[PDB]
A paper describes a structure:
The SARS-CoV-2 spike protein, especially the RBD region, serves as the primary target for interfering with the virus entry process. S1 comprises the receptor-binding domain (RBD) and the N terminal domain (NTD), which mediate the recognition of and binding to the human receptors, including human angiotensin-converting enzyme 2 (hACE2) and other potential co-receptors. To gain further insights into the structural basis of the blocking and neutralizing mechanism, we selected 2 potent hACE2-blocking antibodies (PR1077 and PR953), alongside 1 non-blocker PR961, for subsequent structural analysis. The structure of the antibody Fab/Spike-RBD complex was resolved by X-ray crystallography at the resolutions of 2.5, 2.1, and 2.2 Å, respectively.
PR1077 from H2L2 transgenic mice and PR953 from BALB/C had the most potent neutralizing activities against live SARS-CoV-2 infection of Vero-E6 cells, with IC50 values of 27.9 and 14.4 ng/mL, respectively. Subsequently, based on sequence similarities with related human germlines, PR953 and PR961 were engineered as humanized antibodies. Despite the potent binding, blocking, and neutralizing activities of PR953, its BSA (368.6 Å2 for the HC and 220.2 Å2 for the light chain) was much lower than expected. The complementarity-determining regions (CDRs) of PR953 formed a deep concave binding pocket and tightly covered the flexible tip of the RBM region (I472 to F490), partially overlapping with the hACE2 binding site. The interactions of PR953 were mainly stabilized by an extensive hydrogen bond network. T33, H35, N52, N55, D57, T59, D99, Y101, and Y105 of the HCDRs recognized the bulge region constituted by Q474, A475, G476, S477, N487, and Y489. The interactions were further stabilized by electrostatic interactions among Y91, N92, N93, Y94, and W96 of the LCDRs with S477, S478, N481, and F486. The variable region of PR953 forms a deep concave binding pocket and facilitates tight binding with the flexible tip of the RBM region. Despite its relatively small epitope, PR953 presented potent binding affinity and neutralizing activity by overlapping with the hACE2 binding site.
Numbering used by the authors:
A (entry chain B): 1 to 118, 131 to 243
B (entry chain A): 334 to 527
Write the structure that this text describes.
């Protein structure tokens, strides 16, 4: 049983620094790469960077302008993220999450999140979810669209997020379901136009839905589409 | 007439393990006790066969595989072993029949601040089948993001260099290895010995 247990909330003021941890269990720590993702209140997901725990290799989103550093401690099976020179704009929930390659691609397990309170590169891929809010009725068939600004093949994942929870992985490789994901959820598309389809929508599908590409670094997410379900 | 083992054992250059060399040996006779009673073989291990009995046997074909690895890896050149060498570079089958011969080659295959001419494969999508050989150099994908042939984060050149220096531990010094394998098939047996 895989688990990513992150450390508790932090309150800081401008100029200081925070270090948060992500303790893993249920699997061999060194066999899977760990990623970090930021979510500003109400805002969308942003990829911070990744680290291969077996060799310490790491990479970062240039948007962060160098303020994050990732480390691991192989002994305690723990990953760390340190943020420096914190400002107003750094208040967000910070997630650790596991790249499930080569079995389930993209981010197949997520920590519970750590609250921290105090334009892009020209070749970055933009994922556009043009709908921010949809209302439908129970039983409807729902289509959530996501467009990529460059060809991303089928290297696209979809996640589901309910308030106060980490994102739940639904779809990877554009059309495959993660473990335990109901058949009502299907993904389609290739190249630049992707859709998540929910067949016979139920009350428990009330959530915000996010696409993401992992065809190139930095990994990028769509802005999210909230789905409201009425009787 | 006589099997050319000196051609194999006494070659000037040896293959890297990832590109291990095979010499087929047929239609000849040689004394194996010449080899077993030779000198400075630090490993001479046989499987399914005894060195002394090889003189009384005939095989359809005999292959001599040779390469260089690290001293502490010679133990992986054996049936049933795991590790970077057995998994990714040179794999014997579980029911191997043959002999494994190794000797320290430090002062032939090392250098001043390090010989970096011998390579081994550190990454591979799956384990080698027995007697499989992989000489490819495609970038190895360690995460979900494809590499497109570019080295980078989670995108690794799959071969690594041996750090062969005198003053290394002896476990880190180069050893030359020869693996003889014997196969008795339906066809006529042409490798026998006295
Ligand atoms: C390799 O050369 C040595 C002499 O340096 C010789 O004694 C040995 O028999 C040779 N190995 C053969 C012929 O297999």
């Amino acid at each position: 049983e895989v688990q990513l247990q992150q450390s508790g909330p932090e309150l800081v003021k401008p100029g200081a620094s925070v270090k948060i941890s992500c303790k893993t269990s249920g699997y061999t720590f060194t066999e899977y790469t760990m990623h970090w993702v930021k979510q500003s209140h109400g805002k969308s997901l942003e990829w911070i960077g990744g680290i291969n725990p077996n060799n310490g290799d790491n990479t970062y989103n240039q948007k962060l302008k160098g303020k994050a550093t990732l480390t691991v401690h192989k002994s305690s099976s723990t990953a760390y993220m340190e943020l420096r020179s914190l400002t107003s704009e750094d208040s967000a929930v910070y997630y650790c999450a596991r790249d499930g390659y080569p079995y389930y691609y993209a981010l197949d397990y997520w920590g519970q999140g750590t609250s921290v309170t105090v334009g892009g590169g020209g070749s970055d891929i933009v994922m556009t979810q043009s709908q921010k809010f949809m209302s439908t009725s129970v039983g409807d068939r729902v289509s959530v669209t996501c467009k990529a600004s460059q060809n991303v093949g089928t290297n696209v994942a979809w996640y589901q997020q309910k308030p106060g929870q980490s994102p739940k992985p639904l779809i990877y490789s554009a059309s495959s379901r993660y473990s335990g994901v109901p058949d009502r959820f299907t993904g389609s598309g290739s190249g630049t136009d992707f859709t998540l389809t929910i067949s016979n929508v139920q009350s428990e599908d009330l959530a915000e839905y996010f696409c993401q590409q992992y065809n190139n670094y930095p990994w990028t997410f769509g802005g999210g589409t909230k789905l409201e379900i009425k009787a | 007439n006589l099997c050319p083992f000196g051609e194999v054992f006494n070659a000037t250059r040896f293959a890297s393990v990832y590109a291990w060399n095979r010499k087929r040996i047929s239609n000849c006779v040689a004394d194996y006790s010449v080899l077993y009673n030779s000198a400075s073989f630090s490993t001479f291990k046989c499987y399914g066969v005894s060195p002394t009995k090889l003189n009384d046997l005939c095989f359809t074909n005999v292959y001599a595989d040779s390469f260089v690895i690290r001293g502490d890896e010679v133990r992986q050149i054996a049936p049933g072993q795991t590790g970077k060498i057995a998994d990714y570079n040179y794999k014997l089958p579980d029911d191997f029949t043959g002999c494994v011969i190794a000797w320290n080659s430090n002062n032939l295959d090392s250098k001043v601040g390090g010989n970096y001419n011998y390579l081994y494969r550190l990454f591979r999508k799956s384990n080698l089948k027995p007697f499989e050989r992989d000489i490819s150099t495609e970038i190895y994908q360690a995460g979900s993001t494809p590499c497109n042939g570019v080295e980078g984060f989670n995108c690794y050149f799959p071969l690594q260099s041996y750090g062969f220096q005198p003053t290394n531990g002896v476990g880190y010094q180069p050893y030359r290895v020869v693996v003889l394998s014997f196969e008795l098939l339906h066809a006529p047996a042409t490798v026998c010995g006295p």
